C-alpha cells in the first residue's frame, strides 16, 4: 500500500518524500530550474538553493542573508575538496552517502564546513571503527 | 540508527528525504525563497516551483515550458476549489493528505486537474468504500 493512517487525522503517503527527492534530483540532472552554481576550486556544481538550504547549515545561513540570497554564483573555500563536495551534493539529492576509505576525511571536512551534523557524526563513527 | 547499508554500495539515511521535505515546508511557512504565487479564485498560495513540479504533472508541464517557466504568478482554472488546492499543496510539502467526506470530491477534482495520479487513485478508493 502507498498510504497509512498517521498518528494525526491525515492519510500519510509512505514514499512521497523520497519520490519528491527523486524528482528534485531528476530536475538537477536535466538542469531544470537550477538557480545557483557552487564553485569549488576549478569545479562547478549546478543546484537548487532550497535543496542546499534544506540540507546544510552553511547554505541556510547564506541564502537567508538579504545580500547573498540573490547571488547566482557561490564560491566555497578553495581548500574544499571537489570530490567531497560532489559526494555531499549527491547525498543531499538522494539520501545515499558514497563513503569510502579514500574519501572519508575529505567528506567529513566538507560536511563540517557545510554544517551537515548527521553526516559529520556518521563519518566520525566510521573513522572510530577503523582504529 | 540514522542509516543503513542500501542495496547498492552507498550508506543510506532513513529520514533524509522526510527531513528535506520538512525543511522545505519550513521555508514555505517563513516565505523563504518562494518563487511563485498560485492564484485560485480569490485565494493566493506562495510556493517553490521545484516542489510543485516534483508533485504535479500540470506544474511539471507549466514550469518546463520556455515561456511559462519564468512566470511569477500562475492562475488556475477559476472552477478549482481553493480548499482542495490548499489540502493538495499541504500534502506536497508534508506527505499528509487531509481527506474528509466534506472535501474528498474537491480534492479529487483538483488532483485530476493537477495530474497527481496517486492522490486521484487514493480518492477513488476512499469513495468506493462508502458505496
Ligand atoms: C528557524 C530555523 C529552522 N531551521 C531550518 N529551517 C529550514 C531549513 Cl532549510 C533548515 N535547514 C538546515 C539548517 C541547518 C542544518 C541543516 C538544515 N542540516 C541538515 C539536517 C537534515 C535532516 C536535512 O540532514 C544540518 O545538519 N544543519 C546544521 N533549517 C533550523 C535553523 C537552525 C533555524 F532554527 F534557524
Ligand atoms: C522525463 C520526465 C521525468 N519525470 C519527472 N521528472 C521530474 C519531475 Cl519534477 C517530475 N514531476 C512529476 C511529473 C508528473 C507527475 C508527477 C510528478 N506526479 C507525482 C508523483 C509523486 C511520486 C511525487 O507523487 C504525478 O502524479 N504526475 C503525473 N516528473 C516524469 C515526466 C512525465 C517525464 F517523463 F516527462
From Swiss-Prot, chains A, B:
Cell compartment(s), UniProt: Nucleus
Post-translational modification: Phosphorylated by ATM in response to genotoxic stress. Phosphorylation induces its degradation by ubiquitin/proteasome pathway.
Protein induction: Down-regulated during maturation of dendritic cells by selective stimuli such as bacterial lipopolysaccharides (LPS), CD40LG and zymosan. Protein levels decreases upon genotoxic stress in a dose- and time-dependent way.
Record domain BTB: where: 34-101
Illness: Chromosomal aberrations involving BCL6 are a cause of B-cell non-Hodgkin lymphomas (B-cell NHL), including diffuse large B-cell lymphoma and follicular lymphoma. Approximately 40% of diffuse large B-cell lymphomas and 5 to 10% of follicular lymphomas are associated with chromosomal translocations that deregulate expression of BCL6 by juxtaposing heterologous promoters to the BCL6 coding domain. Translocation t(3;14)(q27;q32). Translocation t(3;22)(q27;q11) with immunoglobulin gene regions. Translocation t(3;7)(q27;p12) with IKZF1 gene 5'non-coding region. A chromosomal aberration involving BCL6 may be a cause of a form of B-cell leukemia. Translocation t(3;11)(q27;q23) with POU2AF1/OBF1.
Assembly behavior: Homodimer. Interacts (via BTB domain) with the corepressors BCOR, NCOR1 and SMRT/NCOR2; the interactions are direct. Forms preferably ternary complexes with BCOR and SMRT/NCOR2 on target gene promoters but, on enhancer elements, interacts with SMRT/NCOR2 and HDAC3 to repress proximal gene expression. Interacts with histone deacetylases HDAC2, HDAC5 and HDAC9 (via the catalytic domain). Interacts with ZBTB7 and BCL6B. Interacts with SCF(FBXO11) complex; the interaction is independent of phosphorylation and promotes ubiquitination.
Domain note: The BTB domain mediates homodimerization. Its dimer interface mediates peptide binding such as to corepressors BCOR and NCOR2. Interaction with corepressors through the BTB domain is needed to facilitate the rapid proliferation and survival of GC B-cells but is not involved in the T(FH) formation and BCL6-mediated suppression of T(H)2 and T(H)17 differentiationrequired for GC formation.
Listed name of the protein: B-cell lymphoma 6 protein
UniProt source species: Homo sapiens
Amino acid at each position: 500500500n502507498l498510504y497509512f493512517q498517521g498518528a494525526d487525522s491525515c492519510i500519510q503517503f509512505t514514499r512521497h518524500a523520497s519520490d519528491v527527492l527523486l524528482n528534485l534530483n531528476r530536475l538537477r540532472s536535466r538542469d531544470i530550474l537550477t538557480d545557483v552554481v557552487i564553485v569549488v576550486s576549478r569545479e562547478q556544481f549546478r543546484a537548487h538553493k532550497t535543496v542546499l538550504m534544506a540540507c546544510s547549515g552553511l547554505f541556510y545561513s547564506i541564502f537567508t542573508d538579504q545580500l547573498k540570497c540573490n547571488l547566482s554564483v557561490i564560491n566555497l573555500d578553495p581548500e574544499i575538496n571537489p570530490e567531497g563536495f560532489c559526494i555531499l551534493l549527491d547525498f543531499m539529492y538522494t539520501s545515499r552517502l558514497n563513503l569510502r576509505e579514500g574519501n572519508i576525511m575529505a567528506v567529513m571536512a566538507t560536511a563540517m564546513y557545510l554544517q551537515m551534523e548527521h553526516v559529520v557524526d556518521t563519518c566520525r563513527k566510521f573513522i572510530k571503527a577503523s582504529e
